């Protein structure tokens, strides 16, 4: 639960830097997709 099983090497450093970076791009969608849905959600309460 505390580490993803891989062993320390130079290649396995770039893959867990890409998977972290490939997760921060997913959260950046979902951080603003929720607020874009919250942008319509206030207007229904403003209706």
């Amino acid at each position: 639960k505390d580490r993803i099983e891989i062993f320390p090497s130079r290649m396995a450093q770039t893959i867990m830097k890409a998977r972290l970076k490939g997760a921060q791009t997913g959260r950046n969608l979902l951080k603003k997709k929720s607020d874009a849905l919250t942008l319509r959600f206030r207007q229904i309460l403003k209706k």
């Binding site: 993803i4 997760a23 997913g26 969608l29």
Partner: protein, 140 residues
């Protein structure tokens, strides 16, 4: 050749469903029809992947003692109405106690997938490290 008729729709539920118009018949050994006797209302049955009650299609009798049963391991079943049946007064339909079949027909009388359902879960599955196992193997 044997089988049965269902009076209402089939619906996947543990309870015994159906009413008194459901009957069993026979064709190729002999031609006879067995209507209901009303001793019990254990008419139809349909269960789809549980572990404490049987999984398959069944008509007549009770649990594990059906008068006609088709199992989930397809191409198998039984008609264990050894003296006769209880709901239908119907005999052992097959030649053996537990038959095996290759042809089945279901005829009505009168009148996307889970892989493409959630686009956020396929986004969360790829983020959590779990792969896809199949690109270029399925259609769209």
């Amino acid at each position: 050749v044997f089988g049965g008729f269902a009076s209402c729709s089939w619906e996947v539920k543990p309870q015994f469903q159906g009413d008194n118009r459901c009957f069993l018949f026979s064709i190729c050994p002999s031609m006879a029809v067995y209507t209901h006797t009303g001793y019990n209302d254990h008419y139809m049955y349909l269960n789809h992947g549980q572990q404490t009650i049987p999984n398959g299609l069944g008509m007549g009798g009770q649990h594990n003692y059906f008068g006609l049963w088709v199992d989930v391991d397809f191409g198998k079943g039984h008609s264990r109405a050894k003296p006769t049946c209880t709901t239908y007064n119907s005999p052992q339909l097959s030649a053996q106690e537990n038959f095996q079949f290759d042809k089945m027909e279901v005829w009505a009388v009168g009148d996307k997938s889970i892989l493409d359902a959630d686009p956020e879960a396929q986004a969360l599955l790829e983020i959590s490290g779990h792969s896809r196992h199949s690109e270029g193997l399925r259609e769209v």
